[PDB]
Design a protein around this ligand. Structure first.
Ligand SMILES: [Ca+2]
Ligand SMILES: [Ca+2]
Ligand SMILES: [Ca+2]
Length: 422
């Protein structure tokens, strides 16, 4: 299938060499593509220390040469993309092209060689003013002068290089901070131009608000369903998976142009710790919900080894090392495969017997996914289109039966279920 049809593994902070070595496992996990952290040169602050708390330096470019101390060299990136292809895995690169580091003295002469390359570092003030949001600085990070056709070619050359090194797609960091052709009199052809590459798949991080212009960006790339992420999280928090709150994407953009998640690296690693509270079960459950969906493209966030239950960085690994083994959890991968096999099937979300603690998604008449957010097991008995027969839970222990259109079986507490003919 295409990248848009499958699931994506966010290999957050995974070095190029780490990725290359876990490639067979990534494949067996049912992922169609992996997303790396920024691969360009950055300001390796705090003396380049690899403590997981230093994750943010990767978002402070100093040049657009490929390679850095956190992820590895440009050669290792290439080898990584090659090892990925040996398994049909696509590679999506996190492109930070809206800004550079805040430290002007760290910026490379290479960048400074570009005449009038920056809008300055005047921090945004009015997040309701498309002018201030796009033309000024985010957190003090020098804002690229994207209206300058010369910066465009410099940045696009970087993207083209990545594609030549084996990259297959992009994730445009802070995409909401780069003007569109119709943003008043300060608009540019930045997006029309840079999205014109051989990239197979590309989406932009556009966190939603009154001025994010979600639908506008969708014309040039897929977009993030940030609101939906909060909808899911709230559901997980209250152990209430009622479909009246988690079926709508809370966005004007339709599923087919949406990239979804249970949590993002931002909601997890920032000092706000807004999603850090979740446990692995909360993730197995949330992932069952979003990854069972039709159209949208789910992004699985790989957490730091030992991370969760409110603790961001427990110190059991550092930047570069692989994340926890949840990305290849039986429940998680079973759902990945379900997502892949059902591609093209319609969907039907519900809450069996009116119990909102039970999520159910029936895709066409080929497969069903159940999610029990409650702390007690539930003997299900609901309508289904699956052909009569016995179905072993692919996501875990247990089995179910389908007789005369009746789906019966027990779904353990805090558990996921995935059923469909072999
Ligand atoms: Ca900008
Ligand atoms: Ca490739
Ligand atoms: Ca904490």
């Amino acid at each position: 299938p295409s990248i848009k049809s499958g699931t994506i593994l966010h290999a957050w902070n995974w070095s190029f060499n780490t990725l290359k070595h876990n490639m067979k496992d990534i494949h067996d996990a049912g992922y169609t593509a992996i997303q790396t952290s920024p691969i360009n040169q950055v300001k390796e602050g705090n003396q380049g220390d690899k403590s997981m708390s230093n994750w943010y330096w990767l978002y402070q470019p100093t040049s657009y040469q490929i390679g850095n101390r956190y992820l590895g060299t440009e050669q290792e990136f290439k080898e990584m993309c090659a090892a990925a292809e040996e398994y049909g895995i696509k590679v999506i690169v996190d492109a930070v092209i809206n800004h550079t580091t805040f430290d002007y003295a760290a910026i490379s002469n290479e960048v400074k060689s570009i005449p009038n390359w920056t809008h300055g570092n005047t921090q945004i003030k009015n997040w309701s003013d498309r002018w201030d949001v796009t033309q000024n600085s985010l957190l003090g990070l020098y804002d690229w002068n994207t209206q300058n056709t010369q910066v465009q070619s410099y940045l696009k050359r970087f993207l083209e290089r990545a594609l030549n090194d084996g990259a297959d797609g992009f994730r445009f960091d802070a995409a909401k901070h780069i003007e569109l052709p119709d943003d008043g009199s300060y608009g540019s052809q930045f997006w029309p131009n840079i999205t014109n590459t051989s990239a197979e798949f590309q989406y932009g991080e556009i966190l939603q608000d009154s001025a994010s212009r979600d639908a506008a960006y969708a014309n040039y790339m897929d977009v993030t369903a940030s609101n939906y992420g909060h909808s899911i999280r709230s559901a997980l928090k209250n152990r209430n998976l009622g479909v009246s709150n988690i079926s709508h994407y809370a966005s004007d953009v339709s599923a087919d142009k949406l990239v979804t998640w249970v949590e993002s690296h931002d909601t997890y690693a920032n000092d706000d710790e807004e999603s850090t509270w979740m446990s692995d079960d909360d993730i197995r459950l949330g992932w069952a919900v979003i990854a069972s969906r039709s159209g949208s493209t789910p992004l699985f966030f790989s957490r730091p080894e030992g991370g969760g239950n409110g603790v961001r960085f427990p110190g059991k690994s550092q930047i570069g090392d692989r994340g926890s083994a949840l990305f290849e959890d039986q429940a998680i991968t079973a759902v990945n495969r379900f997502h892949n096999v059902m591609a093209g099937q319609p969907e039907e979300l519900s809450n069996p017997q009116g119990n909102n603690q039970i999520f159910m998604n029936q895709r066409g008449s080929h497969g069903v996914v159940l999610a029990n957010a409650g702390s007690s097991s539930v003997s299900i008995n609901t309508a289904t289109k699956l052909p009569d027969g016995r179905y072993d839970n692919k996501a875990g222990a247990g089995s179910f039966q389908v007789n005369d259109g009746k789906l019966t079986g027990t779904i353990n507490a805090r558990s996921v279920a995935v059923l469909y003919p072999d």
